């Protein structure tokens, strides 16, 4: 807008905000730490990077989506204010230099599925891009989807080069899978590339890079992660069916020290 904050709307302008420092800048535009002088809040603001010629609200109730506060147009940028939050998934894989524990992905899966499920059943949204970059973790445990928009072509389903985008949600389902496998194993499914198309091919060519029976993965997991990576998108699981899979059900209830973990992974590197 306008800046809306639990749960009053204020007007200000990005030049009004006080700026504390940056966070990257590490693709795509300078993301910024800054304080809204009005109320005392400290937020994220992602500067882009105009222009095309010539968003949320209202995902305020869902606790698994990073909350947007408003935007924020100038002649050069496009500023978007978001809740301040730890880090990407993608950057934890690299920072950890090794996989994330099944327990954490299980939490993740739950935060993530319910988000996509939220968006679809409340806003008729089909968020195109489900991937590690878009999954934000935080110091105090929370796990959230950034609704935004080889490598990032790899996450494409089979039926996204077939007989006629899109048909339908099931494509995000796929990207959830690959994200999980990428994430569980700490190694992108297709090590043989890049970059790329010798990727896109493999996908429609070959059978899902399902989870290795080897690394000690609760076959509840292996099961879920496979229901997703179903080639045949037709009988593939809608979000609800995933919501009543067992791997989910476990993880809806099972208590996990996500804060504790994250913090510890902040031991290395820094
Ligand atoms: C909402 O609070 C945030 C807090 C952050 O620290 C980042 C972002 C948001 C960014 C969201 C959009 C992209 O996910 C991001 O540009 C990216 O690819 C880099 C991820 C690793 C980097 C160090 O962390 C952030 O910058």
From Swiss-Prot:
Protein's name in the database: Dual specificity mitogen-activated protein kinase kinase 7
Any one annotated GO CC term: cytoplasm
Residues binding ATP, per UniProt: 23-31, 46
Family that this chain belongs to: Belongs to the protein kinase superfamily. STE Ser/Thr protein kinase family. MAP kinase kinase subfamily.
Known function: Dual specificity protein kinase which acts as an essential component of the MAP kinase signal transduction pathway. Essential component of the stress-activated protein kinase/c-Jun N-terminal kinase (SAP/JNK) signaling pathway. With MAP2K4/MKK4, is the one of the only known kinase to directly activate the stress-activated protein kinase/c-Jun N-terminal kinases MAPK8/JNK1, MAPK9/JNK2 and MAPK10/JNK3. MAP2K4/MKK4 and MAP2K7/MKK7 both activate the JNKs by phosphorylation, but they differ in their preference for the phosphorylation site in the Thr-Pro-Tyr motif.
GO-annotated molecular function: ATP binding; enzyme binding; JUN kinase kinase activity; magnesium ion binding; MAP kinase activity; MAP kinase kinase activity; molecular function activator activity; protein kinase binding
Native organism: Homo sapiens
Modes of activity regulation: Activated by phosphorylation by specific MAP kinase kinase kinases such as MAP3K1/MEKK1, MAP3K3/MEKK3, MAP3K11/MLK3 and MAP3K12/DLK.
Subcellular location: Nucleus; Cytoplasm
Any one GO BP annotation for this protein: response to tumor necrosis factor
Catalysis performed (reactions): L-seryl-[protein] + ATP = O-phospho-L-seryl-[protein] + ADP + H(+); L-threonyl-[protein] + ATP = O-phospho-L-threonyl-[protein] + ADP + H(+); L-tyrosyl-[protein] + ATP = O-phospho-L-tyrosyl-[protein] + ADP + H(+)
Domain notes: The DVD domain (residues 377-400) contains a conserved docking site and is found in the mammalian MAP kinase kinases (MAP2Ks). The DVD sites bind to their specific upstream MAP kinase kinase kinases (MAP3Ks) and are essential for activation. The D domain (residues 37-57) contains a conserved docking site and is required for the binding to MAPK substrates.
Residues of the full protein shown: 104 to 402 of 419
Chain residue ranges for the region called DVD domain: 245-268
Gene that produces this protein: MAP2K7
């Amino acid at each position: 807008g306008y800046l809306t904050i639990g749960g009053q709307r204020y007007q200000a302008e990005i030049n009004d905000l006080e700026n504390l420092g940056e966070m990257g800048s590490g693709t795509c535009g300078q993301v910024w730490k800054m304080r809204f002088r009005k109320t005392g809040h400290v937020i994220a603001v992602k500067q882009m990077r105009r222009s095309g010629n010539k968003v949320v609200l209202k995902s305020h109730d869902c606790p698994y989506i990073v909350q947007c506060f408003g935007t924020f147009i100038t002649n050069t940028d496009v500023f978007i204010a978001m809740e301040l939050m730890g880090t990407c998934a993608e950057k934890l894989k690299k920072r950890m230099q090794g996989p994330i524990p099944e327990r954490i992905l299980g939490k993740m899966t739950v935060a993530i599925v319910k988000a996509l499920y939220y968006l679809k059943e409340k806003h008729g949204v089909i968020h195109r891009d489900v991937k590690p970059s878009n999954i934000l973790l935080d110091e105090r445990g929370q796990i959230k989807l950034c609704d935004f928009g080889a490598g990032c072509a790899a996450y494409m389903a089979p039926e996204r080069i077939d007989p006629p985008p899109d048909y339908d949600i099931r494509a995000d389902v796929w990207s959830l899978g690959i994200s999980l496998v990428e994430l569980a194993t700490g190694q992108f499914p297709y090590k043989n590339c890049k970059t790329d198309f010798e990727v896109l091919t493999k996908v429609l060519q070959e059978e899902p890079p399902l989870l290795p029976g080897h690394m000690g993965f609760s076959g509840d997991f292996q099961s879920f992660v496979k229901d997703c990576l179903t080639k045949d998108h037709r009988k593939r699981p809608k979000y609800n069916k995933l919501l009543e899979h067992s791997f989910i059900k476990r993880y809806e209830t099972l208590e996990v020290d996500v804060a504790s973990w994250f913090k510890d992974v902040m031991a290395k590197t820094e």
